[model samples]
Target: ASIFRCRQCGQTISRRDWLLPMGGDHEHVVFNPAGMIFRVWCFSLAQGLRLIGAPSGEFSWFKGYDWTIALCGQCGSHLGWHYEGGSQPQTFFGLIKDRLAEGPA
Candidate 1:
């Protein structure tokens, strides 16, 4: 099994979360208008992330969901985005690849 943790705080953010397909993919690279590129991994769930700000439809990376900024609950390190208001699954986490550290459980 794999364990993913916050890069800055070393707090466990995912436990037992697995690959989840979003838009026909489990991962995606998004280029933001702010000159930043994020390679986000779609997760079925995230165990330890804090959401900031109200979800906004504007500038959403995911086509059919509202996006909220996700941060490490412990240190407040920027993790990625939390997507909600989708179909049956309704919600998921889009975690930045570089913002997390992966290890064996």
Candidate 2:
């Protein structure tokens, strides 16, 4: 058997490091280029809810860019995306790597 190490951690990720979903569309949307075995995803709605309560406000700028799955280079763990908005910083944006880390990273 070959001893595989995480490209990000440079060490084998313990079982604890692997998080399982609680039933939903939780899944890696992107593949780690460096690690090649790690998975990731774009920002999730749940995270947005944590920030602005379902993005519902009177004349409030709140919109979902999208969701993608991928791995992070620092921790080599699953991550989500939530792109920035436009005009009022809540109009246009793409859920990307950093956005995911903003909260629900």
Best by lDDT: 1
Over 4 Å off, model 1: 15-17
Note the Cα lDDT for every prediction shown: 0.86, 0.30
Q: Give residue 53's error in model 1 in angstroms.
A: 1.9
Cα RMSD (angstroms) for every candidate in the order listed: 1.5, 12.8
Candidate closest to the true structure, highest TM-score: 1
Q: For candidate 2, lDDT tens digit of each residue in 37-104?
A: 32332222222221222332232213333223333434644433333433333332112222232211
lDDT of 2: 0.30
Instruction: Give the total clashing residue pairs for model 1.
Output: 0
Q: Per-residue alpha-carbon lDDT of model 1 for 1-105, expressed as tens digits?
A: 489989897999885358788768888998877989999999988878889989987888887789999989899999998989988579989999889988888
Quote the positional error of residue 38 for candidate 1 in Å.
Answer: 0.5
